[PDB]
Amino acid sequence: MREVISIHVGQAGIQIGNACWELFCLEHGIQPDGQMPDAFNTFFSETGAGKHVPRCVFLDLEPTVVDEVRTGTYRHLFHPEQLISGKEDAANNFARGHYTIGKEIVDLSLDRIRKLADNCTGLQGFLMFNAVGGGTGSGLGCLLLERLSVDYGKKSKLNFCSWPSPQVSTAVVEPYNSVLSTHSLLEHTDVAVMLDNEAIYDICRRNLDIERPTYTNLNRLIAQVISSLTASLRFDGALNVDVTEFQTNLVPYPRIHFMLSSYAPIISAEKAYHEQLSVAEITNSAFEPASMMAKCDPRHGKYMACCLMYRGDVVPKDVNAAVATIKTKRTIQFVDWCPTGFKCGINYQPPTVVPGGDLAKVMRAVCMISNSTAIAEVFSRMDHKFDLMYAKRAFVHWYVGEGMEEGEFSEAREDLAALEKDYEEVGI
Amino acid sequence: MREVISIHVGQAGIQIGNACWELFCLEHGIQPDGQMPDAFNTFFSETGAGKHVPRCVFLDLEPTVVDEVRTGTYRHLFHPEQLISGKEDAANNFARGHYTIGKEIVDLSLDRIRKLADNCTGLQGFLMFNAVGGGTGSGLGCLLLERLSVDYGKKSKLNFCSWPSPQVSTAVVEPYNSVLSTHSLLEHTDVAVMLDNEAIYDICRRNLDIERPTYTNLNRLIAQVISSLTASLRFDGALNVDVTEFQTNLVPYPRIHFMLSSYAPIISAEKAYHEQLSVAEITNSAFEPASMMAKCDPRHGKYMACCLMYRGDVVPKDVNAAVATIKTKRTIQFVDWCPTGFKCGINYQPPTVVPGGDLAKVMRAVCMISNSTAIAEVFSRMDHKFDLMYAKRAFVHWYVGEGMEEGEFSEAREDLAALEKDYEEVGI
Amino acid sequence: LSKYGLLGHDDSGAESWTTETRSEYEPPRLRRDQLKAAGQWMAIHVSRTHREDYIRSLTPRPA
Amino acid sequence: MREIVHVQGGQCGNQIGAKFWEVISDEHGIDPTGTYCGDSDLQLERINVFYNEATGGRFVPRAILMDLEPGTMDSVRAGPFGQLFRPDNFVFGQTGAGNNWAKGHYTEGAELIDSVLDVVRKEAEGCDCLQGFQITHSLGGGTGSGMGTLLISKVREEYPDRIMETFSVFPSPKVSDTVVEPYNATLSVHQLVENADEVQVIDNEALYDICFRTLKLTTPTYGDLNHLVSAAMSGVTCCLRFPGQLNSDLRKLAVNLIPFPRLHFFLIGFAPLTSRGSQQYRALSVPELTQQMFDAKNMMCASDPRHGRYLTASAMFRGRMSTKEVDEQMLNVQNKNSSYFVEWIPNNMKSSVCDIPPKGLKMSVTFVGNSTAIQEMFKRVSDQFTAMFRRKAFLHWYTGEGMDEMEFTEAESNMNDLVSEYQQYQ
Amino acid sequence: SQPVFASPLNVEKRRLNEERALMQAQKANIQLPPNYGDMDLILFPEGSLKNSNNTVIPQSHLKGKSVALYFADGADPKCASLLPFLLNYYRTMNEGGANQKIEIIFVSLDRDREAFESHRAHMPWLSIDLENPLTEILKRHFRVMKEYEVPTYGYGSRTGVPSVIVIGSDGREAQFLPICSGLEEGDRALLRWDWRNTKFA
Ligand SMILES: Nc1nc2c(ncn2[C@@H]2O[C@H](COP(=O)(O)OP(=O)(O)OP(=O)(O)O)[C@@H](O)[C@H]2O)c(=O)[nH]1
Ligand SMILES: Nc1nc2c(ncn2[C@@H]2O[C@H](COP(=O)(O)OP(=O)(O)OP(=O)(O)O)[C@@H](O)[C@H]2O)c(=O)[nH]1
Ligand SMILES: Nc1nc2c(ncn2[C@@H]2O[C@H](COP(=O)(O)OP(=O)(O)O)[C@@H](O)[C@H]2O)c(=O)[nH]1
Ligand SMILES: [Mg+2]
Ligand SMILES: [Mg+2]
């Protein structure tokens, strides 16, 4: 009955899912070949002599990423038909994955999603991993969600998408891939979680205190977020939550569906001894502005709804004291129309650790998925960079020759500006 | 007792025949010599000290493959004059194989047909395999159906012919060969099954996904298909639907018996470990509109009837649920005068796979031999290829110099056009 | 001098060439092993201490 | 898979391509007789990008060598790695282009057209899908400039939806071989702006000068001159054959560099280029490479970007190295070189972690950059044209093979209209 | 008899088996000669298998594995293009599993001992040295031939150099791996190796 599929589109999707499926395989006692030496139903599928096939698709137009998991140590855990390759890289271009040859990928990707969905007692998740600013992350990410919207109507679309940073972009057309993706991400996905890179390099600076993390240490943290978010479907807990009611818990309005992510406690094994991590202090360590993973200050953003997922030996009564002292604390702004804005779920198992990872073993953990008005300020700075790209029409006519009409930048602009104005009128 | 007689005409039919008799001998436990270290009685006679001979005839006007079998592995499984071969290849000429060179071994072929048929009473039918697009497969096949309809009028005539494909047809005079055998298999053949080389090319490159297999691998897939047809004859099961029922339920008109074929699951070596063999998904893939063996798209045609031969440890309940969900899908449609058009003949024996071949040991299988109004498009492109070629007397003098009169060219054209009007009128 | 030429400032070769995905995302029980040879691994107190309550706090769950 | 088609054009192109096929071959670990040696998946799994099979396991490069004189092609069979190429891939000229663009493009090169198409189409359509091309040619002589730009004028309209990278060796302000300098330079470049996807500018005069301070050797032969080019030749396309954390290809490299279709001339440089005395004494790390590749003195082109301003920069780092040490270290160079970068584009750079280091070196970087600093090099070629064209000098050899005074003046007008956007994008 | 009739393994096969069957003849309804199921062999003697550091490994290690002959030559460039690819496929089976699953045995086509060592040190799986006549009699059994020098017995060569082939308990082949064959799937056919139907038992 419990069943969530994953759709990794883009090099960020394959790399994040590389950490996700190694974390999931070690947690259920699954070897890299797939067979264990009833909670595995929600992420895997039983077949043969206990050998488990993950309900997943690894999609990427270019090679050299998707063949890397076709040649690594996880080749023979995945079904080799959701491993999808093209030949041509989407080339950091939105219209290459949306208006020229990517149809040969999406026409059989819907076939593989249909085949995966005809394996299921009940569907409750559409976890899509991608980068916003990548060419195939925005390009095919737009086309897959519009195809799945008209195919599968009223189900939950999860989406953990990598927003570009305010400071670095690692590209000059990051505004050109962000406003186009958002213009069709408002109407297609249901839950959009913002992720952002040097929020989390700064996380690994002052908390994990290791001198060289990389993109792969980024993905291990994100996999810990997804594992605690969907742990309630796996194991029994004191207060079981469901992914299909995160949809009704967070969003107030049909167009307001952007939330945040933060994980705690995050302390390496050397400094995990001076203090005993209690429930009342991991909540304060997660609610602090320097622990969230999008580097937007919640001091100037009004909180709206908040959901906390617990993993370990935690009783609910010191949870009740912990959420009370957060609610009476003034440095976290709550808005006047919503006095009740907390949903806490509690699960029994302790969080798992990768063997010898930078994360230390801990008896309890909190994941926070929170809706706030501060997303309007992340979006208003990308708003400013889009006009300053469009001031003399730079990098626009290769999009025009790609297949988009010159002028759909205007209504993608007006959808983003309608996103700018409506959080302002909500916050009053 | 209970036996069938298989006929092979032309070296295409021979290369089918040595493949089906390759699989028939191994599943019955007998060897190339004829010894095994009473279910085999339908395909092999009993001769004294356990030696078995197939109930077949091999017919080919050239020795280029017949005596090569006489030097190959299966020398002594076959009877010596079971393999009948003339000297002169008919060479893509229907007239040559109908009038001059065919009749020298027509009387030889009927003599061996009489001698194998009168061996035991209770014969069910003839399973004839030939090449429509060639010379001796079309011409000598026409005389055998002409002379068997006058001796064994009552007995069944199941045909399996290698019709061309619209893209690749490997010939230049095959519009003349095919429509001249069209006159033969309407009023003589009981039920005709359309096969196609390039559709089985399509299957083996994407489903079992070898880049370059050849004639010898299509021969395995034909051998699997005819095995699943004849399985209900050989082995017991839940329901027994043998070759005398196949025409009671699939063809509702004397002139409408052209009908397709499908096999699922055609599984590669790597695909067998992960993909669980659910009865729900093997019926879905059998009904997949590009998984059949004709290049015959059924999305713009209606379905008259359908038989599904399940082979393995198959329970009938999830068969009944599999045929429940295929009606509830709006993607395919059945014809308006026939709401129930399904058969479920189940046999307990699992399929017999060849070690060292290309398929894998599957626990279950399904064979889909279906009548549809989609014969119209595979015959109307065929009609159009005749129209552009006959209009300027090309390759016409070759046939009229061999005895065939001009005028039988014309009446075969309106014979095909009359069948085209039959399929158009019945789909209302 | 070198064994690889002018561009080679020192000698590493292709024997030291793997990727981050191949070197790090190798099988996990293997990754337990070579790290085992190189270093793998209001306040509330126990019921012994007389801080907050200690009489009835000792009885249902002793510690 | 993704196929790149290489062309050697002219004497300079043949010699600079010979060294590049030596440095790619031992980067993949391949004996020059064709047999692979080195025992690694990671240098052999992507070999079809540049090479082809030979039904013996032998690998032959996808390179055609084209030249109107037989001299310097006989030297590359005579030299090392001469057996590596396909014998059919060579096409011969028995006359010799005597430093004239007219016999390079119009007259003497016309009879070699029917043979050069038949060998580049034979190599192209043999694969399932071509990715791009990569030629090497010089604008100085005749058989490199004229006979080379004739290739661009034909390969584009027959393969329209593809790309190519042309590595053009540009003449010198100070030293001057090939005394008819401005005529061959201008006649190649006005074709090259209209009809080529990007141009990398390579300057001999400056690359002697990198060879005189940072590589500081007294006797520079043409061997290590081309070896310094072949490092950035290899680094600009390293991720086509190698995996990485953040990938890059040629088609992507064009999309996020060129803003407007008439500027595609790019600086190029390779870091580190450490002196022989300084070899052991550099604990090489990301901070010191970033200052080395954002160093004007270390640019292969003879243009100083202090006068210019980088429109968009790009860096393909190579090796085992941290990824945020790319990121906020380039945010440091924006915050310190504020006036050296264009203000109406924020985050002007590429980051690309090619996960495979160069041959022997632990970690490096290859810099390519769209700069407006090339306007000073393009205007000295313009006044070199006009100084010798007012006096009508060295024109009789051109006009005798079907030139025109009219066709020379849209060559200068396209030259001035090429420079024109550069100083008004400042 | 399997897979090839005339081979030095299979003339030793018939000489061994019905010899002990005629031992059973005058010892005692025995039938002569025995059936092909009744013939049994030892494929590798005690002093054949050498691992990486040149120590003996007995036949008992091979139980429950998927063992395949690797017919290869060091100087062959097609072997050069295959050898890393089969190295990767070895470590993915071995490390991705509680018990290491496949096993590759080496037989060589090299010129001399020195060339054998240079190709041997790159290989972690088990190997058979060239001076053992077990190598040469295995050439004529599975029909692997570089260029036709030794007389074939009315056969045509099944493979070319290099060729990997999975085997069974009694010298039979289980399923073919076409890297240079009628399918000629070079450097991709290693994925076709199964391990549910071919176990050395
Ligand atoms: N958090 C995180 N972000 C990533 C990762 N990989 C790439 N990104 C982000 O993705 C952006 C570019 O998109 P990519 O994922 O690299 O490339 P792509 O999705 O394949 O699309 P293309 O540009 O067409 O290749 C970069 O700016 C990165 O910030 C990753 O592993 N983790
Ligand atoms: N199914 C199948 N069809 C084949 C095979 N070989 C040839 N064909 C088909 O046969 C068609 C033509 O007939 P042929 O087999 O060439 O020869 P023929 O029918 O005996 O007539 P002749 O050429 O005169 O001998 C070709 O278009 C092929 O599609 C085969 O091995 N299997
Ligand atoms: N980098 C490099 N430049 C060269 C080489 N040989 C000649 N050149 C330069 O190329 C110019 C001559 O052009 P060249 O290509 O020889 O004329 P072409 O034969 O007609 O194409 C001279 O100014 C040299 O500076 C070489 O081997 N390497
Ligand atoms: Mg990509
Ligand atoms: Mg005939």
Catalytic residue chosen out of the listed positions B22, B68, B211, B245:
B245
From B126, B163, B133, B165, select the one nearest B147 (Cα to Cα): B126
Q: Which helix (H) or strand (E) holds E4?
A: none
How far apart are the C-alpha atoms of D325 and B346, rounded to whole Å? Answer: 65
SS3 assignment, position A83: strand
The radius of gyration of chain D from alpha carbons, rounded to an integer in Å, stands at 21
How far apart are the C-alpha atoms of E41 and E13, rounded to whole Å? Answer: 7
Provide the pairing of β-strand A191-195 with A258-259: parallel
Q: Does C42 touch chain A (CB under 8 A)?
A: yes
Type of residue at B283: T
Residue D303 has which token pair?
């243009």
CA atoms within 13 A on the CB side of A131: 28
Q: Which of E37, E182, E194 faces B269 most closely, judged by CB atoms?
A: E194
Residue E104 near residue E125 (C-beta atoms within 8 A): yes
Provide the pairing of β-strand B262-264 with B366-372: antiparallel
From A306, A303, A426, A428, select the one nearest A374 (Cα to Cα): A303
What is the maximum span of chain A, computed from C-alpha positions, in angstroms?
62
Going by the DSSP 8-state scheme, the letter that residue C43 receives in this structure is -
If phi > 0 it is left, if psi is from -120 to 50 it is alpha, else beta; for residue D93 that is beta
Question: 3-class secondary structure for chain D?
Answer: CCEEEEEEEHHHHHHHHHHHHHHHHHHCCECCCCCECCCCHHHCCCCCCCEECCCCCCCEECEEEECCCCHHHHHHHHCCCCCCCCCCCEECCCCCCCCCHHHHHCCCCCCCHHHHHHHHHHHHCCCCCEEEEEEEEECCCCCCCHHHHHHHHHHHHHCCCCEEEEEEEECCCCCCCCCCHHHHHHHHHHHHHHHCCEEEEEEHHHHHHHCCCCCCCCCCCHHHHHHHHHHHHHHCCHHHHCCEEECCCHHHHHHCCCCCCCCCEEEEEEECCCCHHHCCCCCCCHHHHHHHHCCHHHCCCCCCCCCCCEEEEEEEEEECCCCHHHHHHHHHHHHHCCCCECCCCCCCCCCEEECCCCCCCCEEEEEEEEEHHHHHHHHHHHHHHHHHHCCCCCCHHHHCCCCCHHHHHHHHHHHHHHHHHHHCCC
Residue D5 has which token pair?
């088609």
Measured CA to CA in angstroms, residue D203 lies from D136, D139, D422 at distances of 13, 11, 20
How far apart are the C-alpha atoms of A244 and A154, rounded to whole Å? Answer: 11
Q: Does E199 touch chain D (CB under 8 A)?
A: no
CB contact under 8 A, B356 and E174: yes
Min Cα separation A348/chain E (Å): 29
How far apart are the C-alpha atoms of D308 and A200, rounded to whole Å? Answer: 36
Nearby residues for ligand 5 (ion, Cβ within 5 Å): B 90, 97, 135-136, 139
**CB burial string E61-88: b at 16+ within 10 A, e below:** ebeebbbbbbbbbbebbbbbbbbbbbbb
How far apart are the C-alpha atoms of A340 and B41, rounded to whole Å? Answer: 79
The position carrying tokens 């912990």 is A322
In this structure, what are the phi and psi dihedrals at residue B241, rounded to the nearest 5 degrees? -120, 100
Sequence-distant (≥ 6) Cβ neighbours of residue E41 within 8 angstroms: E9, E13, E16, E170, E171
If phi > 0 it is left, if psi is from -120 to 50 it is alpha, else beta; for residue B382 that is alpha
Residue B19 near residue B219 (C-beta atoms within 8 A): yes
A90 to chain D: nearest residue by CA? D252
How far apart are the C-alpha atoms of B306 and B322, rounded to whole Å? Answer: 13
The Cβ of residue B252 has, within 10 Å, a number of other Cβ atoms equal to: 15
The position carrying tokens 């198959």 is B314
From B238, B261, B234, B63, select the one nearest B158 (Cα to Cα): B261
What is the maximum span of chain E, computed from C-alpha positions, in angstroms?
58
Q: Which residues pair with D63 in a beta bridge?
A: D6
Residue A142 near residue A174 (C-beta atoms within 8 A): no
Chain A residue numbers touching B284 (CB-CB < 8 A):
118
The technique is cryo-EM
From A7, A243, A228, select the one nearest A117 (Cα to Cα): A7
How far apart are the C-alpha atoms of D50 and D32, rounded to whole Å? Answer: 15
SS3 assignment, position E66: strand
SS3 assignment, position B111: helix
Residue B165 Cβ < 6 Å to ligand 2: no
Ligand 1 — pocket residues by CB below 6 A? Answer: A 10-12, 15-16, 62, 89-92, 131, 133-137, 162, 170, 195, 197, 215, 218-219; D 246
Question: Hey, CA dihedral for E148, E152, E154, E155, is it positive or negative?
Answer: negative
* Residue D194 is labelled as binding a ligand: no
From A137, A139, A157, select the one nearest A148 (Cα to Cα): A157
The position carrying tokens 């030429």 is C5
Residue A345 CA, chain-centre distance (Å), reads: 19
Residue E110 has which token pair?
């090299």
CB contact under 8 A, A31 and E98: yes
Residue D294 has which token pair?
């954002």
CA atoms within 13 A on the CB side of B94: 27
Q: What is the resolution of this structure in A?
A: 3.5
Residue A228 has which token pair?
């605690």
Residue A102 near residue A136 (C-beta atoms within 8 A): yes
How far apart are the C-alpha atoms of B396 and B409, rounded to whole Å? Answer: 9
CB contact under 8 A, D251 and A89: yes
Type of residue at D76: V
B19 CA → ligand 2 middle, Å: 15
Locate the ligand 3 atom nearest the alpha carbon of residue D142 and give its number. 20
How far apart are the C-alpha atoms of B104 and B100, rounded to whole Å? Answer: 8
Sequence-distant (≥ 6) Cβ neighbours of residue D232 within 8 angstroms: D268, D269, D270, D300, D366, D367, D368
SS3 assignment, position B174: helix
User: Is B in contact with C (3 or more beta carbon pairs below 8 Å)?
Assistant: no
The position carrying tokens 């994407």 is B206
Residue D256 has which token pair?
């996020």
Residue D191 near residue D153 (C-beta atoms within 8 A): yes
Type of residue at A104: E
Provide the pairing of β-strand A56-59 with A5-9: parallel
From D68, D44, D63, select the one nearest D4 (Cα to Cα): D63
How far apart are the C-alpha atoms of B107 and B116, rounded to whole Å? Answer: 15
Nearest CA to ligand 2 atom 18: B134
Question: Hey, CA dihedral for B183, B189, B190, B195, is it positive or negative?
Answer: negative
What number of C-beta contacts closer than 8 Å exist between A and C?
Answer: 44
How far apart are the C-alpha atoms of D340 and E88, rounded to whole Å? Answer: 48
The position carrying tokens 């290698």 is B162
Residue A322 CA, chain-centre distance (Å), reads: 26
Residue D278 has which token pair?
């300084």
Going by the DSSP 8-state scheme, the letter that residue A329 receives in this structure is -
Residue E6 has which token pair?
């005339």
Residue B49 has which token pair?
């000290």
Residue D367 near residue D394 (C-beta atoms within 8 A): no
How far apart are the C-alpha atoms of D211 and D225, rounded to whole Å? Answer: 8
